[PDB]
Every structure is written in structure tokens, then in C-alpha cells.
Amino acid sequence: SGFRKMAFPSGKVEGCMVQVTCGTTTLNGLWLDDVVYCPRHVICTSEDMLNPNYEDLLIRKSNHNFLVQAGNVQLRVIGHSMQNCVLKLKVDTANPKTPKYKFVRIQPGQTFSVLACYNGSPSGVYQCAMRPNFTIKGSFLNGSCGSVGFNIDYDCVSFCYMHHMELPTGVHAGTDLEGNFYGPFVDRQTAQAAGTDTTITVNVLAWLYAAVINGDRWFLNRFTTTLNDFNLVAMKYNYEPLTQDHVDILGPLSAQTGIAVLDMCASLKELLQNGMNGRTILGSALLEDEFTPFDVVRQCSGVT
Amino acid sequence: SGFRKMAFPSGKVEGCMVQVTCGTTTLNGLWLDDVVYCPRHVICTSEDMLNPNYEDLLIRKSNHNFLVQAGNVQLRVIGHSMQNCVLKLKVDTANPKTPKYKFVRIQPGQTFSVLACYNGSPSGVYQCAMRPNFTIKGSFLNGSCGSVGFNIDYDCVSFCYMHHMELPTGVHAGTDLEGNFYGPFVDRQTAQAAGTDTTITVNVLAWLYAAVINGDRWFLNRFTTTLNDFNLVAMKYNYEPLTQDHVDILGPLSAQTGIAVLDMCASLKELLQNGMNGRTILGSALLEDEFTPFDVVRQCSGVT
Ligand SMILES: C[C@@]1(C(=O)Nc2nncn2C2CC2)CCOc2ccccc21
Ligand SMILES: C[C@@]1(C(=O)Nc2nncn2C2CC2)CCOc2ccccc21
């Protein structure tokens, strides 16, 4: 037992991190097969970021201007193209460590692991969620752009995120591996404010189920509620509305614990209305929303 | 910017995980050079755990009774010995993926990453701290024994922990890689209760410095305190006493932020006495103590 904010093992993704340099700018690239993926802002100076015309800035770049280094060995760049906000650099060598992989675009509320990198080298791994306002709250310093977010299904790495930007509020923005930004964000040094960061209700309920499985039961009460009644409270507390799809997804956790989904909603409702009163749930003093119901099942069963 | 509970990249340790089976019991082993390290309780039945005589149980075991599998390939066991609470299985093949490594015994308050494993396969990675009562609060199910805790200094993995046990309270106990338990715990299914789980004061102060660096400054006040005055409050709140050694260790964070160590102690004192009042610091509603001052510097500078 015990329940932790766990990230996927990062080895398969570490084998893909390379360093990409264009002019004075160095960031991270993802090397899969004979292609290196990186944020297109690698071609910009700090001055260009205010109002970059990426197509025009890219005409001045040739294959030899993109320096790609995998560990301490240089990769030969034989092609380059821009797909949305990422550059795809064709190299003459397939990455020998390329794992089985997919490029997926996740939904808000979904979680993933980030392998934070600097100069193509991994610094650490942590678990994130795509917020309902399409930002992530990561740990990213200068040089961390090009670090990726991913999930793993046994031996297949599903890449879902590539880091590009830090908003003036300290939150993070990026793209899927096709270069499309999550949310309305653009790769330009301009006023971009995030919308309401609501709480991922289905994730909190999944985490309440993990708490019951792992022995933290104080918050369980004698009440029940309905989806409509719960959602009035959820609205008031800036929580995502709960749908019948969410109830269905929580079905296995409900079955394993014997606590009906709406009963757990009534427990959550009282926690919202009354607070924790100085108590904790799974070592946290706030309601955690960065575990999906699939993460809870995975961790509570021991999936590898 | 942004600050996260970050674990080290696990690739180097994933390359060392093997499966060890003895009789009906399967757990994890750590393969470094031509030795596989695992908890000695691999030789026990569930019945043996009540009062095992490890030397006597081990006489009935031969090299061929320890089945070691690295991925899907069997390793030939050519020697076996017991060192304290671990077994060292000599195999005929050096692990080709053995990283540069050390075996270190950490102090309470120190943090490390755990690569939770099942049947020699990695399931996830998370950051831990050796609690002041010598327990860890991990996420460990049946079959996770033999999973290891570690730190990394560039390319050198310092192994500090091997998982062995779950106490009836849901907390975890284990050994360093020489097989010596942290704390007073023994590998026997018996009444073992942990002592006071105090808060690692120097870690909380380090995390308050990370919060100021990353923009969360509301808790900064107009006060100062002394070590002796701070420690009276720390005692009342079950916090570890702060020593001049801790003040010295926080020196670089104090320098970087311009906030004297004792001023931050006065901020911590008011947080203890007054609570958070429904506010958060780095997305947490409790004072976090699982970041050392070295972890804060590492993450805030981008060490790889
Ligand atoms: C490259 C840059 C950026 O945000 N980098 C970044 N990302 N996460 C963290 N950091 C560092 C600031 C800490 C700089 C600001 O202008 C922009 C504008 C758009 C896209 C990127 C960027
Ligand atoms: C093997 C065992 C154990 O605690 N295993 C373990 N460790 N972390 C998690 N789990 C599973 C229980 C979930 C079982 C109980 O008796 C003992 C007694 C001593 C040492 C080990 C053990």
C-alpha cells in the first residue's frame, strides 16, 4: 500500500533526448527514427520572439545551421521542415534506441510524465496534468524547451507534449508532437493570459477512491447526492462538471471499494463545503486532481 | 520557473532491475557487475515470516534454487551469500548496462528516488525522504520488495535503499545496499511500530526558499527569530531542531534570495502558529519537507 505522485520510468525517453542548437539558441530535441523534433522557436533570437515570422526566419536557415548532438556525437542533418510550431530535422541515422511510439493529443484532465531536459540531458522526471485551461504547471527553466511529456503502455511510448513556453504567470504551454499548441497559446513573447484553472473533478474522485483503498477513510460520510446536485456545488467551487461518462470511468474503483460513485460525490461535496479542518488525505491538505481514474487503477494493481 | 516533486531520470536504474524467484516467492533484484542484490526474505514462505531463522532457512537453498531473470533471459547463479538482510547472488555474466555506482547509507531527512518494480519490471518512479523515524512513505504492493532508492551525481548512481517491508501502519522499511535496515526494523512479520514522524525543518526552509525564487512570497513577514527561539516553536510542532549546520547548508539559498536564514525561520514560525488560512505555497496546503536544500539548488539551476 501507499499512494504516490508517480511518473513513468523515463529510460525509454532518455534514449531519445538530443541537443539542438540554432545560432545562439540551444534547446532539446526528440530523436525518433531518423527525425529530430524540436520547438520552431529554436530559430529565434530573444528579439525575434516579440513578433516572429517563422516562415521568413526559416528561409535564412539551411540543414547545416541546425546542430544536433546525441550525447557527445554529432548527427548529420539532411532535411528540415516546419509542421505547425515544431521543426522536424531529418538526420542520416535512425536512433538505435527508438522505442515503439505513438504521437497522441491528450484531453484536459489527462496526466503524463515530463522528462525535464537541459542541453539534451535529462535532469528529472515528474508527473503533470493537462489543466482544463490547456496549461501545465511544470518545472521548466531556460534551455528546457523541447522536453517532452509522455505516457507508456507496456513498451509503447505515447508522446503527448513538447514544452515551448512559460506564460508571464509562471504556468507552462506547449504542443502535441504534431506541433499544435494545447489551448489558444502561440509561440510569441506577448501578453497571453490563461483562463480559469478549474479542478478536474473526476480525478479528485479517483484520488478519493485511492485514499479509501490505502486506508484514509475519515472523509466518508452518510450522504449521497445526484449528478445535478453535485454539479451545482462543483460550479460554485470552480470544479469541472461531472458527466455520466466520468461516473462510468469510475465504475471499476466504485466496484473495488463498494462505495457508489454518487456517495463519493457526496463525500466530495461535504469536503468542498466544510474544508479539511486541518486533516489530510494521502498526506495532502488539498484535494488532489492530478491522478486520473486509470492512474489510480494502474498504481493500485502494480502495472509495469 | 515552477517547482515540482521531481525524481531522478530512472534509465540507469531500469537497466539493473531483474526478477528473483525462490520457491513460490518472487521479488526484485538489483544486478550490478556480476552480483544480484535482493532482500533475504525471498527465501521465506508467508508462514516463515512470523519467526524466520534466516541462516537455517538458507542452508536448504542451493545456487540453482535462486531463479534470476533479466528481461526474458535467465542468469546463471554461481554463488550466493547473505550480508545482513540482503542476499548477494553471484551470476556468471556482468550486467552490460551497469552504471558507475556507489552504495551509500543516507541520514534521516535525505531524499531519494524510488523505481518501484514488480517481477523485475519498472512500474514508476517517485521522490521519497528517509523520515526522521527511519521509515519512508512509499507506494509498494506485494512483489515490490527489492525495488531500490537512489540519487545520481551526473553519471554515478548512489544506491541508498532497498525495499523490504510494510509496517502494519502502512509505512515502509528497508535497508541500505549492505543489507542494514534503516532504523530499528527487522525483516520479520511482527509488531513493529514506528516512532514520531517529525517534520524535517531544514527541508521546509529549503522549500520556502524555492517558493520565494518561484514567486510565492505571501508568507514573508517583518520578523526575525533566533535558533533557540525558533527551536522552542519547532519542538511544540514536532519539527526537527534546527542546528547551525542546517543554517550553513541553507547559506546559498539565503544568498540567492537575500532573505537571511533566521528571517525565513520567523516566517516558518508564524506559518506554524497561524496556519495557511486557506492559502497555498507552491500548490501545497501543507509545509513540504521532502526537498533538501541540495534538491532546491539542483532544480532551481537545472543540473543534469
Ligand atoms: C523561450 C521563451 C520561454 O518561455 N522559455 C521557457 N519555457 N519554459 C521556461 N522558459 C524560460 C523562461 C524560463 C522565452 C520567453 O519568450 C518566449 C515566448 C514564446 C515561447 C518561448 C519563449
Ligand atoms: C513480504 C512482507 C511485506 O511487508 N511486503 C511488502 N513490502 N511493501 C509492501 N509489501 C506488501 C504487503 C503489501 C509481507 C508481510 O510480512 C513481511 C515481514 C517482513 C518483511 C516483509 C514482509
XYZ file of C-alpha atoms and ligand atoms in Angstrom:
652
model
C 0.000 0.000 0.000
C 0.831 3.750 -0.016
C -0.052 6.130 -2.887
C 2.399 8.482 -4.590
C 2.535 11.057 -7.428
C 4.374 8.610 -9.651
C 5.894 9.227 -13.024
C 6.525 6.559 -15.653
C 10.085 5.121 -15.809
C 11.934 7.557 -18.084
C 14.636 5.286 -19.649
C 12.856 4.849 -22.983
C 12.515 8.648 -23.345
C 16.060 9.425 -22.097
C 17.280 7.372 -25.063
C 15.579 9.929 -27.379
C 16.818 13.225 -25.957
C 19.226 15.221 -28.090
C 20.539 18.809 -28.038
C 19.538 21.159 -30.871
C 21.339 24.451 -31.483
C 20.445 27.106 -33.993
C 22.650 30.206 -33.911
C 22.974 31.323 -30.288
C 19.889 29.279 -29.222
C 20.155 25.779 -27.660
C 17.184 23.659 -26.605
C 16.120 19.981 -26.543
C 15.068 17.740 -29.397
C 13.321 14.376 -29.504
C 15.067 11.860 -31.785
C 12.775 9.076 -33.065
C 13.816 7.019 -36.154
C 15.679 9.446 -38.493
C 13.760 12.575 -37.327
C 14.554 15.049 -34.557
C 11.552 17.041 -33.318
C 12.033 20.419 -31.614
C 10.195 23.755 -30.987
C 10.479 26.019 -34.081
C 11.458 28.930 -31.791
C 14.997 27.397 -31.821
C 15.469 29.609 -34.930
C 14.707 32.824 -32.965
C 16.880 35.344 -31.190
C 15.371 36.792 -27.926
C 14.489 39.900 -30.029
C 12.707 37.784 -32.712
C 10.323 36.341 -30.031
C 8.364 39.634 -29.791
C 6.904 39.226 -33.304
C 8.490 36.302 -35.217
C 7.537 35.445 -38.778
C 8.602 31.827 -38.649
C 8.361 31.164 -42.420
C 10.609 34.190 -43.112
C 13.083 33.381 -40.303
C 13.274 29.790 -41.596
C 14.244 30.799 -45.209
C 17.589 32.056 -43.804
C 18.273 28.569 -42.260
C 19.920 25.636 -44.048
C 20.383 21.968 -42.898
C 23.945 22.802 -41.700
C 22.659 25.582 -39.387
C 20.862 23.059 -37.110
C 23.475 21.482 -34.862
C 22.176 18.201 -33.400
C 24.201 16.373 -30.788
C 23.175 12.996 -29.275
C 25.288 12.591 -26.150
C 28.692 13.690 -27.425
C 28.178 12.699 -31.070
C 27.005 14.999 -33.829
C 24.135 13.964 -36.098
C 24.152 14.878 -39.803
C 21.061 16.983 -40.722
C 19.884 16.064 -44.289
C 16.457 17.745 -44.297
C 14.351 20.232 -42.317
C 10.722 21.210 -42.338
C 8.258 23.080 -40.207
C 4.991 21.381 -39.119
C 2.852 23.870 -37.205
C 5.089 25.001 -34.204
C 7.696 22.192 -34.412
C 10.645 21.610 -36.658
C 11.324 18.140 -37.950
C 15.020 17.674 -38.688
C 15.750 14.651 -40.858
C 19.059 13.084 -39.806
C 21.113 10.436 -41.690
C 20.990 7.936 -38.749
C 17.935 6.253 -37.240
C 18.033 6.499 -33.408
C 19.118 2.977 -32.370
C 17.304 3.408 -29.054
C 13.942 4.412 -30.704
C 11.189 2.735 -28.639
C 7.768 1.699 -30.049
C 5.935 5.023 -30.067
C 2.815 6.997 -30.905
C 2.021 10.687 -31.091
C -1.219 11.394 -29.223
C -3.067 14.612 -28.452
C -4.439 14.394 -24.939
C -7.611 15.951 -23.444
C -7.646 18.375 -20.485
C -7.661 16.355 -17.256
C -5.272 13.760 -18.681
C -1.980 13.177 -16.924
C 1.541 12.492 -18.215
C 5.167 12.338 -17.198
C 7.636 15.055 -18.215
C 11.354 14.351 -18.580
C 12.794 17.803 -17.950
C 15.964 18.262 -20.008
C 18.762 20.801 -20.481
C 21.166 20.694 -23.477
C 19.788 17.254 -24.466
C 20.469 15.854 -20.967
C 17.781 14.648 -18.555
C 17.550 16.477 -15.242
C 14.440 14.902 -13.690
C 11.051 13.311 -14.180
C 7.696 14.392 -12.715
C 4.011 13.804 -13.189
C 1.747 16.571 -14.755
C -1.849 17.045 -15.865
C -3.092 18.996 -18.850
C -5.106 21.658 -16.968
C -8.678 22.440 -18.100
C -7.339 25.861 -19.332
C -4.728 23.933 -21.500
C -1.694 24.941 -19.443
C 0.529 22.641 -17.323
C 2.251 23.576 -14.086
C 5.752 22.240 -14.706
C 9.285 22.980 -13.623
C 10.999 24.491 -16.640
C 13.974 26.804 -16.767
C 15.732 28.410 -19.783
C 17.010 25.649 -22.041
C 14.189 23.191 -21.041
C 12.129 23.789 -24.216
C 11.845 20.618 -26.298
C 11.469 18.469 -23.120
C 8.527 16.053 -23.700
C 5.501 14.703 -21.858
C 4.522 11.089 -22.346
C 2.592 8.011 -21.211
C 3.746 4.385 -21.581
C 1.588 1.329 -22.401
C 4.000 -1.562 -21.502
C 6.679 -0.976 -24.223
C 4.987 1.768 -26.300
C 5.714 5.463 -25.503
C 2.820 7.785 -26.402
C 4.263 11.243 -26.699
C 1.672 13.857 -25.960
C 3.502 17.098 -25.152
C 6.547 19.142 -26.091
C 7.459 22.127 -23.937
C 7.606 25.528 -25.656
C 6.681 28.379 -23.372
C 6.335 29.937 -19.981
C 3.411 32.407 -19.589
C 4.041 35.600 -17.590
C 2.013 33.945 -14.743
C 4.585 31.133 -14.363
C 2.400 28.445 -15.946
C 3.531 26.411 -18.953
C 2.364 25.972 -22.572
C 3.303 23.601 -25.318
C 2.286 21.469 -28.208
C 1.482 17.872 -29.093
C 4.163 16.155 -31.315
C 2.402 17.410 -34.478
C 3.308 20.958 -33.339
C -0.222 22.065 -32.459
C -0.434 24.079 -29.237
C -2.675 22.872 -26.469
C -5.176 25.697 -25.958
C -5.053 29.128 -27.532
C -1.354 29.797 -26.904
C 1.084 30.988 -29.573
C 4.934 30.831 -29.609
C 5.385 34.582 -29.336
C 6.674 36.762 -26.388
C 3.337 38.577 -25.930
C 0.519 39.076 -23.399
C -1.106 35.678 -23.136
C -3.234 35.004 -20.076
C -4.618 31.624 -19.159
C -8.339 31.069 -18.474
C -9.851 29.640 -15.287
C -7.847 26.827 -13.857
C -10.747 24.635 -12.769
C -10.329 21.423 -10.674
C -10.556 18.058 -12.558
C -13.454 16.608 -10.628
C -13.240 13.004 -11.985
C -9.521 12.994 -10.937
C -10.325 14.137 -7.384
C -12.945 11.341 -7.064
C -10.426 8.822 -8.424
C -7.913 10.081 -5.771
C -10.625 9.770 -3.013
C -11.059 6.123 -4.111
C -7.210 5.649 -3.860
C -7.384 7.108 -0.339
C -10.087 4.609 0.754
C -8.076 1.652 -0.793
C -4.984 2.897 1.090
C -6.767 3.345 4.445
C -7.631 7.086 4.630
C -11.407 6.867 5.254
C -12.267 9.769 7.623
C -13.972 11.787 4.868
C -16.513 9.019 4.093
C -19.984 10.192 5.174
C -23.631 9.009 5.471
C -24.770 11.003 2.401
C -25.471 10.600 -1.221
C -26.169 13.160 -3.973
C -27.232 13.298 -7.702
C -25.143 14.467 -10.711
C -27.222 17.638 -10.983
C -26.990 18.431 -7.243
C -23.259 17.665 -7.153
C -22.666 19.885 -10.223
C -24.303 22.925 -8.551
C -21.658 22.655 -5.784
C -18.936 21.835 -8.331
C -19.839 25.013 -10.280
C -19.616 27.143 -7.099
C -16.164 25.687 -6.304
C -14.683 26.001 -9.840
C -14.716 22.248 -10.331
C -15.312 20.655 -13.762
C -18.914 19.383 -14.212
C -19.209 15.628 -13.662
C -20.816 13.715 -16.529
C -22.247 10.181 -16.808
C -19.064 9.351 -18.834
C -16.980 10.204 -15.699
C -19.270 8.054 -13.486
C -18.802 5.148 -15.932
C -14.980 5.610 -15.925
C -15.012 5.472 -12.085
C -17.042 2.191 -12.243
C -14.096 -0.144 -11.501
C -12.989 1.930 -8.461
C -16.569 2.010 -7.204
C -16.741 -1.801 -7.621
C -13.449 -2.451 -5.884
C -14.325 -0.323 -2.850
C -18.102 -0.891 -2.660
C -18.687 2.885 -2.500
C -21.131 4.084 -5.151
C -19.875 6.948 -7.356
C -22.634 9.349 -6.157
C -21.875 8.509 -2.490
C -18.235 9.519 -3.077
C -19.593 12.687 -4.795
C -21.494 13.479 -1.567
C -18.247 12.978 0.394
C -16.510 15.389 -2.018
C -19.366 17.877 -1.677
C -19.012 17.964 2.142
C -15.209 18.320 1.751
C -15.763 21.321 -0.520
C -18.366 22.909 1.743
C -16.597 22.183 5.031
C -12.898 22.045 4.176
C -10.382 19.548 5.639
C -10.496 21.041 9.211
C -6.720 20.660 9.472
C -6.818 16.984 8.407
C -5.022 15.318 5.456
C -5.925 12.718 2.769
C -2.979 10.685 1.401
C -0.584 13.191 3.019
C -2.180 16.144 1.216
C -4.072 19.116 2.742
C -5.794 19.914 -0.604
C -7.973 17.784 -2.878
C -5.546 16.281 -5.497
C -6.646 16.334 -9.110
C -3.530 15.116 -10.984
C -4.412 11.350 -10.834
C -6.807 10.003 -13.437
C -9.037 7.007 -12.613
C -6.648 4.964 -14.909
C -3.610 6.147 -12.880
C -5.336 5.039 -9.646
C -6.094 1.514 -11.023
C -2.564 1.240 -12.503
C -0.794 2.171 -9.262
C -3.174 0.181 -7.028
C -2.691 -3.030 -9.145
C 1.067 -2.698 -9.952
C 1.120 -2.367 -13.764
C 4.641 -2.473 -15.382
C 10.278 28.625 -13.277
C 7.819 26.288 -11.477
C 8.838 23.790 -8.754
C 7.929 20.101 -8.741
C 8.479 16.931 -6.655
C 10.971 15.620 -9.182
C 12.620 12.252 -9.284
C 15.934 11.498 -10.981
C 15.744 10.012 -14.519
C 15.404 6.267 -13.899
C 17.025 4.787 -17.075
C 20.331 3.899 -15.415
C 18.479 2.003 -12.648
C 15.951 0.344 -15.010
C 18.963 -1.276 -16.686
C 19.730 -3.022 -13.345
C 16.339 -4.450 -12.407
C 15.972 -8.217 -12.512
C 13.402 -10.715 -11.186
C 14.448 -13.103 -8.402
C 12.387 -16.170 -7.505
C 12.979 -18.564 -4.664
C 10.385 -21.326 -4.319
C 6.936 -19.731 -4.515
C 8.343 -16.230 -3.741
C 9.152 -13.664 -6.483
C 10.575 -10.201 -5.840
C 13.032 -7.732 -7.430
C 16.806 -7.852 -7.560
C 19.426 -5.245 -8.410
C 22.032 -6.505 -10.901
C 25.357 -4.618 -10.754
C 28.521 -6.209 -12.276
C 28.229 -10.000 -11.660
C 26.147 -9.657 -8.439
C 22.382 -9.553 -7.951
C 21.263 -7.970 -4.671
C 17.860 -8.812 -3.170
C 16.029 -8.966 0.225
C 16.904 -12.234 2.048
C 13.178 -12.763 2.770
C 12.957 -14.108 -0.838
C 13.813 -17.472 0.815
C 10.713 -17.337 3.084
C 7.214 -18.705 2.763
C 4.429 -16.428 4.208
C 4.450 -18.789 7.255
C 8.260 -18.432 7.715
C 7.888 -14.598 8.056
C 6.409 -14.909 11.585
C 9.728 -16.113 13.060
C 12.352 -16.842 10.357
C 15.805 -18.155 11.175
C 17.490 -16.922 8.032
C 20.755 -18.884 8.486
C 18.765 -22.134 8.895
C 16.357 -21.381 6.015
C 19.364 -20.564 3.802
C 21.138 -23.956 4.405
C 18.277 -25.631 2.470
C 18.957 -23.329 -0.571
C 21.474 -24.008 -3.348
C 22.625 -21.741 -6.268
C 20.094 -23.470 -8.597
C 17.162 -22.589 -6.284
C 17.534 -18.830 -6.998
C 15.947 -18.144 -10.372
C 17.209 -14.830 -11.793
C 15.689 -13.440 -14.959
C 16.881 -10.208 -16.654
C 14.117 -9.237 -19.065
C 13.317 -12.596 -20.646
C 16.770 -14.155 -20.224
C 17.847 -16.371 -17.359
C 21.066 -15.640 -15.472
C 23.273 -18.483 -14.207
C 23.718 -18.292 -10.386
C 27.285 -19.447 -9.440
C 27.411 -18.264 -5.813
C 25.163 -16.973 -3.017
C 25.777 -15.335 0.309
C 23.893 -13.433 2.945
C 25.140 -9.981 4.073
C 22.950 -8.714 6.906
C 19.335 -8.649 5.415
C 20.297 -8.936 1.711
C 21.352 -11.829 -0.434
C 24.129 -11.358 -2.932
C 23.756 -13.774 -5.837
C 26.906 -14.117 -7.921
C 25.975 -14.614 -11.581
C 28.265 -15.735 -14.460
C 27.590 -12.543 -16.526
C 28.445 -8.952 -15.624
C 25.425 -6.662 -16.251
C 26.372 -4.904 -19.518
C 24.245 -1.915 -18.512
C 25.967 -1.495 -15.063
C 26.309 2.273 -14.485
C 29.069 3.883 -12.351
C 27.723 3.317 -8.847
C 28.194 3.641 -5.104
C 26.422 2.178 -2.104
C 25.668 4.936 0.407
C 23.804 4.939 3.708
C 21.768 8.114 3.931
C 20.770 10.175 7.008
C 17.162 10.913 8.044
C 15.956 13.991 6.153
C 17.766 12.943 2.975
C 15.740 12.428 -0.171
C 15.962 9.864 -2.984
C 14.126 8.467 -5.964
C 12.487 5.029 -5.857
C 11.970 2.956 -9.002
C 9.010 0.823 -7.965
C 9.243 -2.589 -9.638
C 7.199 -5.782 -9.991
C 8.708 -9.071 -11.287
C 11.906 -7.211 -12.295
C 9.913 -4.670 -14.353
C 9.699 -0.948 -13.585
C 6.242 0.424 -12.852
C 7.020 4.021 -11.848
C 9.413 6.477 -10.266
C 8.776 8.860 -7.353
C 10.663 11.007 -4.908
C 10.933 9.971 -1.155
C 12.640 11.135 2.026
C 14.111 8.986 4.760
C 11.803 10.075 7.618
C 13.338 11.060 10.983
C 11.811 7.802 12.422
C 13.708 5.819 9.646
C 10.609 4.867 7.661
C 9.668 6.056 4.135
C 6.160 6.670 2.856
C 6.273 4.870 -0.486
C 3.893 3.130 -2.834
C 4.691 -0.560 -2.570
C 2.465 -3.524 -3.265
C 3.192 -7.286 -2.974
C 6.076 -8.136 -5.279
C 7.689 -4.630 -4.955
C 10.360 -5.758 -2.449
C 13.858 -5.376 -3.893
C 12.883 -2.055 -5.590
C 15.683 0.484 -4.854
C 16.087 4.109 -3.821
C 18.888 6.143 -5.330
C 20.477 9.517 -6.091
C 22.508 10.379 -9.214
C 25.609 12.617 -9.428
C 25.859 13.198 -13.246
C 26.669 9.585 -14.350
C 27.146 7.896 -10.941
C 24.149 6.169 -9.249
C 24.389 6.151 -5.439
C 22.112 3.416 -4.228
C 20.866 4.131 -0.760
C 17.772 1.987 -0.182
C 16.284 -1.408 -0.950
C 12.638 -2.021 -0.107
C 11.869 -4.882 2.294
C 8.799 -4.267 4.391
C 5.479 -2.644 5.020
C 4.683 -1.886 8.707
C 1.120 -2.535 9.923
C 0.636 1.300 9.832
C 1.173 1.414 6.042
C 4.633 2.997 6.227
C 7.694 1.394 4.639
C 11.014 -0.035 5.896
C 14.141 -1.192 4.184
C 17.865 -1.410 4.105
C 20.895 0.256 2.550
C 22.685 -1.906 -0.131
C 24.865 -3.525 2.573
C 21.644 -5.063 3.973
C 21.481 -2.967 7.141
C 17.976 -1.755 7.995
C 17.355 1.934 8.366
C 16.126 2.346 11.945
C 15.239 -0.422 14.357
C 13.185 -2.518 11.925
C 13.677 -6.252 11.380
C 12.552 -8.460 8.429
C 10.001 -10.388 10.458
C 6.117 -10.316 10.356
C 5.789 -8.952 13.915
C 4.529 -5.912 15.857
C 6.854 -3.122 14.826
C 5.667 0.428 15.401
C 7.419 3.489 14.080
C 8.439 6.388 16.358
C 7.402 10.028 15.965
C 7.345 11.152 12.401
C 8.762 14.631 12.939
C 8.958 17.310 10.171
C 12.406 17.881 8.523
C 12.762 21.537 9.380
C 15.815 22.305 7.154
C 13.842 20.801 4.192
C 10.794 23.000 4.863
C 13.045 26.115 4.947
C 14.719 24.996 1.709
C 11.199 24.611 0.161
C 10.212 28.133 1.459
C 13.309 29.469 -0.362
C 12.157 27.603 -3.570
C 8.743 29.257 -3.158
C 10.272 32.774 -2.965
C 12.507 32.047 -6.072
C 9.379 30.833 -7.916
C 7.202 33.820 -6.930
C 5.148 32.612 -3.914
C 6.034 35.338 -1.369
C 2.850 35.946 0.696
C 4.260 34.183 3.774
C 7.282 36.534 4.022
C 6.913 38.693 7.152
C 8.566 41.605 9.041
C 10.042 39.320 11.742
C 13.193 37.597 12.678
C 13.957 34.979 15.356
C 16.987 33.135 16.928
C 17.859 29.397 16.692
C 16.870 28.887 20.327
C 13.555 30.770 19.969
C 12.731 29.013 16.690
C 13.514 25.599 18.251
C 11.018 26.146 21.112
C 8.267 26.507 18.460
C 9.759 23.670 16.386
C 9.632 21.387 19.466
C 5.948 22.259 20.079
C 5.097 21.459 16.432
C 7.058 18.158 16.194
C 9.637 19.702 13.893
C 13.311 18.624 13.949
C 15.557 21.073 15.887
C 17.449 23.443 13.586
C 21.219 23.479 14.080
C 23.964 25.873 12.919
C 24.926 23.107 10.399
C 21.425 23.483 8.818
C 21.785 27.307 8.721
C 25.155 26.883 6.959
C 23.644 24.416 4.418
C 20.886 26.975 3.638
C 23.586 29.675 3.061
C 23.454 29.568 -0.767
C 19.622 29.858 -0.820
C 19.800 32.730 1.654
C 22.403 34.432 -0.594
C 20.431 33.936 -3.779
C 17.213 35.361 -2.324
C 18.626 37.979 0.078
C 16.479 36.574 2.913
C 18.533 35.714 5.993
C 18.082 32.152 7.316
C 16.674 33.366 10.687
C 14.200 35.694 8.898
C 12.866 32.682 6.957
C 12.720 30.820 10.325
C 10.474 33.627 11.644
C 8.263 33.228 8.547
C 8.076 29.473 9.259
C 7.285 30.149 12.918
C 4.285 32.357 12.000
C 3.137 29.698 9.479
C 3.239 27.088 12.246
C 1.469 29.295 14.778
C -1.117 30.730 12.385
C -1.597 28.075 9.711
C -2.030 28.764 5.964
C -5.520 30.400 6.344
C -6.711 28.537 3.248
C -3.730 29.712 1.152
C -1.142 27.574 -0.704
C 2.670 27.650 -1.208
C 3.927 26.036 -4.448
C 0.481 24.442 -4.913
C 0.600 22.770 -1.491
C -1.665 23.406 1.542
C 0.906 21.871 3.957
C 4.548 22.731 4.626
C 6.590 20.357 2.345
C 9.595 18.650 3.868
C 10.694 16.211 1.122
C 13.079 18.674 -0.677
C 16.576 19.064 0.719
C 18.445 22.374 0.290
C 20.576 20.494 -2.370
C 17.394 19.437 -4.241
C 16.202 23.076 -4.275
C 19.539 24.364 -5.727
C 19.658 21.472 -8.247
C 16.134 22.063 -9.564
C 16.414 25.875 -9.496
C 19.713 25.803 -11.528
C 18.904 22.914 -13.953
C 21.521 20.266 -13.069
C 21.645 17.209 -15.448
C 11.903 30.866 -24.924
C 10.788 31.543 -24.103
C 10.210 30.722 -22.928
O 9.097 30.958 -22.479
N 11.020 29.754 -22.386
C 10.661 28.925 -21.344
N 9.757 27.964 -21.357
N 9.712 27.427 -20.082
C 10.583 28.068 -19.363
N 11.210 29.031 -20.095
C 12.206 30.014 -19.627
C 11.729 31.362 -19.220
C 12.198 30.388 -18.188
C 11.319 32.882 -23.531
C 10.240 33.944 -23.451
O 9.608 34.151 -24.728
C 9.039 33.010 -25.236
C 7.889 33.189 -25.989
C 7.309 32.086 -26.598
C 7.873 30.837 -26.456
C 9.013 30.668 -25.688
C 9.604 31.748 -25.048
C 6.802 -9.552 2.407
C 6.156 -8.701 3.517
C 5.953 -7.203 3.198
O 5.840 -6.375 4.092
N 5.857 -6.854 1.873
C 5.687 -5.566 1.412
N 6.553 -4.571 1.466
N 5.937 -3.461 0.916
C 4.745 -3.824 0.549
N 4.520 -5.136 0.840
C 3.274 -5.902 0.646
C 2.334 -6.021 1.792
C 1.988 -5.154 0.625
C 4.773 -9.301 3.879
C 4.440 -9.137 5.348
O 5.470 -9.689 6.188
C 6.700 -9.123 5.970
C 7.526 -9.020 7.080
C 8.814 -8.531 6.913
C 9.259 -8.158 5.664
C 8.420 -8.249 4.566
C 7.119 -8.715 4.703
